[PDB]
Amino acid sequence: MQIFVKTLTGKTITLEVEPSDTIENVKAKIQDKEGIPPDQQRLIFAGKQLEDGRTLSDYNIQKESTLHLVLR
């Protein structure tokens, strides 16, 4: 499924992911696409900071959802 990741620079990128993917995997995908190191990535959805070892499904992230990416 497609999701959106809205960064603080004005850029929103798209990713192809599965709800069973871990947050760590998603951060690795963001690194692949945009070059941002995972340890700098703070991901937020529905007021919650996302934890590396959990999955997208754990946070009820569905198709066409938007995550917020803030850099540490």
Coordinates of C-alpha atoms in Angstrom, one line a residue:
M1 CA 0.0 0.0 0.0
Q2 CA 1.0 3.6 -0.5
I3 CA 1.6 5.9 2.4
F4 CA 2.8 9.6 2.6
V5 CA 5.6 10.9 4.8
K6 CA 5.4 14.7 5.3
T7 CA 8.8 16.2 6.2
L8 CA 9.4 19.6 7.7
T9 CA 11.0 21.0 4.5
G10 CA 7.8 21.2 2.5
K11 CA 8.4 17.8 0.8
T12 CA 6.1 14.9 1.1
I13 CA 7.4 11.6 -0.1
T14 CA 5.5 8.4 -0.9
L15 CA 6.4 4.9 0.1
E16 CA 5.2 1.4 -0.8
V17 CA 4.9 -0.6 2.4
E18 CA 2.9 -3.5 4.0
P19 CA 1.1 -3.1 7.4
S20 CA 3.2 -6.0 8.7
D21 CA 6.5 -4.0 8.1
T22 CA 8.4 -2.7 11.1
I23 CA 9.0 0.9 11.8
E24 CA 12.7 0.1 11.5
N25 CA 12.0 -1.1 8.0
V26 CA 10.1 2.0 7.1
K27 CA 13.0 4.2 8.3
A28 CA 15.4 2.2 6.2
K29 CA 13.1 2.8 3.2
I30 CA 13.2 6.5 3.9
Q31 CA 16.9 6.4 4.0
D32 CA 17.0 4.6 0.7
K33 CA 14.8 7.1 -1.0
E34 CA 15.8 10.4 0.6
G35 CA 19.2 9.6 2.2
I36 CA 18.2 10.5 5.8
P37 CA 20.0 8.4 8.4
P38 CA 17.5 6.3 10.5
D39 CA 18.8 7.5 13.9
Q40 CA 17.8 11.1 12.9
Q41 CA 14.2 10.1 12.0
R42 CA 11.4 10.8 14.5
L43 CA 8.2 9.5 13.0
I44 CA 4.8 10.6 14.3
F45 CA 1.3 9.3 13.5
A46 CA -2.0 10.2 15.3
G47 CA -0.1 12.0 18.1
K48 CA 2.2 9.0 18.8
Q49 CA 5.9 8.7 18.2
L50 CA 6.5 5.4 16.4
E51 CA 8.8 2.8 17.9
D52 CA 11.3 0.9 15.7
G53 CA 10.4 -2.7 16.8
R54 CA 6.6 -2.3 16.3
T55 CA 4.8 -2.6 13.0
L56 CA 2.7 -0.1 11.0
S57 CA -0.4 -2.3 11.8
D58 CA 0.2 -1.9 15.6
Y59 CA -0.5 1.9 15.1
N60 CA -3.5 1.3 12.8
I61 CA -1.7 2.9 9.8
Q62 CA -3.8 2.3 6.8
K63 CA -3.5 3.0 3.0
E64 CA -3.0 6.6 2.1
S65 CA -2.1 7.5 5.7
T66 CA 0.3 10.4 6.3
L67 CA 3.2 10.1 8.8
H68 CA 5.2 13.1 10.0
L69 CA 8.9 13.0 9.9
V70 CA 10.8 15.4 12.2
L71 CA 14.6 15.3 12.3
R72 CA 16.5 15.0 15.6

